Design a protein around this motif. Structure first.
Motif, PDB file in Angstrom:
ATOM      1  N   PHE A  45      -5.272   8.342   0.914  1.00 23.45           N
ATOM      2  CA  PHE A  45      -4.153   8.852   0.135  1.00 23.45           C
ATOM      3  C   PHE A  45      -2.957   7.916   0.300  1.00 23.45           C
ATOM      4  O   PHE A  45      -3.054   6.839   0.894  1.00 23.45           O
ATOM      5  N   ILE A  46      -1.805   8.323  -0.236  1.00 32.14           N
ATOM      6  CA  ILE A  46      -0.595   7.520  -0.086  1.00 32.14           C
ATOM      7  C   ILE A  46      -0.239   7.374   1.387  1.00 32.14           C
ATOM      8  O   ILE A  46       0.234   6.319   1.826  1.00 32.14           O
TER       9      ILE A  46
ATOM     10  N   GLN B   2       6.402   5.606  -9.135  1.00 27.86           N
ATOM     11  CA  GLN B   2       5.598   5.919  -7.963  1.00 27.86           C
ATOM     12  C   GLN B   2       4.243   6.444  -8.415  1.00 27.86           C
ATOM     13  O   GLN B   2       4.170   7.316  -9.286  1.00 27.86           O
ATOM     14  N   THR B   3       3.176   5.911  -7.825  1.00 26.79           N
ATOM     15  CA  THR B   3       1.821   6.303  -8.178  1.00 26.79           C
ATOM     16  C   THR B   3       0.998   6.464  -6.911  1.00 26.79           C
ATOM     17  O   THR B   3       1.324   5.913  -5.858  1.00 26.79           O
ATOM     18  N   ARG B   4      -0.089   7.228  -7.030  1.00 27.65           N
ATOM     19  CA  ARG B   4      -0.942   7.476  -5.876  1.00 27.65           C
ATOM     20  C   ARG B   4      -1.474   6.181  -5.280  1.00 27.65           C
ATOM     21  O   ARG B   4      -1.769   6.127  -4.082  1.00 27.65           O
ATOM     22  N   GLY B   6       0.245   3.336  -5.123  1.00 30.58           N
ATOM     23  CA  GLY B   6       1.344   2.677  -4.437  1.00 30.58           C
ATOM     24  C   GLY B   6       2.599   2.737  -5.288  1.00 30.58           C
ATOM     25  O   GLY B   6       2.803   3.685  -6.044  1.00 30.58           O
TER      26      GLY B   6
END
Ligand SMILES: *[C@@H]1O[C@H](CO)[C@@H](O[C@@H]2O[C@H](CO)[C@@H](O[C@@H]3O[C@H](CO)[C@@H](O)[C@H](O[C@H]4O[C@H](CO)[C@@H](O)[C@H](O)[C@@H]4O)[C@@H]3O)[C@H](O)[C@H]2NC(C)=O)[C@H](O)[C@H]1NC(C)=O
Ligand SMILES: *[C@@H]1O[C@H](CO)[C@@H](O[C@@H]2O[C@H](CO)[C@@H](O)[C@H](O)[C@H]2NC(C)=O)[C@H](O)[C@H]1NC(C)=O
Ligand SMILES: *[C@@H]1O[C@H](CO)[C@@H](O)[C@H](O)[C@H]1NC(C)=O
Lengths: 47, 42
Positions: A45-46, B2-4, B6
């Motif tokens: 995940f992030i 903003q994205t999963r 990055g």
């Protein structure tokens, strides 16, 4: 393709494999069972 | 943006949906189009 609202499949019953609208993830009962069964690690995940 | 996957810098974010042109990750794709910025500016 999208299944019709009325499930008149001549007596066959596909409730447990078709999507479940209630769940946030539109996954069927068996799909949820499998996802819970597998204990995934390193999701990525992030974080 | 903003994205999963990055942080995405330099790409305008739209809310339409098209075919994946340049795959980014986590269901996000990027493409080159007019997409307003106007009708011809790319
Ligand atoms: C297609 O097959 C599935 C099989 O699950 C069926 O869904 C439900 O299956 C169960 C068991 O066959 C049905 O009976 C239930 O039995 C349990 C105990 O084993 C009870 O707790 C249930 O009582 C309540 O909960 C159900 C779900 O919330 C309600 O539907 C029910 O009215 C009670 O409020 C229940 O008696 C169960 O009735 C079905 N239905 C559902 C929605 O779960 C499915 O119904 C089959 N397809 C069709 C068109 O029937
Ligand atoms: C850095 O990533 C983290 C998540 O891993 C976030 O940081 C926080 O985000 C929430 C709001 O969504 C709030 O707690 C704060 O705004 C942020 N900082 C802290 C200490 O919580 C966020 O995605 C990124 N950081 C910022 C400031 O946006
Ligand atoms: C895109 O989604 C809806 C309109 O479809 C709107 O609420 C949202 O603000 C839009 N976001 C951007 C960056 O245009």
């Amino acid at each position: 393709y999208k299944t019709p609202p009325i499930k008149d499949f001549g007596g066959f019953n596909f409730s447990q494999i078709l999507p479940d609208p209630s769940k946030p993830s539109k996954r069927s009962f068996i799909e949820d069972l499998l996802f819970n069964k597998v204990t995934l690690a390193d999701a990525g995940f992030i974080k | 943006f903003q994205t999963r996957a990055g942080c995405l810098i330099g790409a305008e974010h739209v809310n339409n949906s098209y075919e994946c042109d340049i795959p980014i990750g986590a269901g996000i794709c990027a493409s080159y189009q007019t997409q307003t910025n106007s009708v011809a500016s790319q």
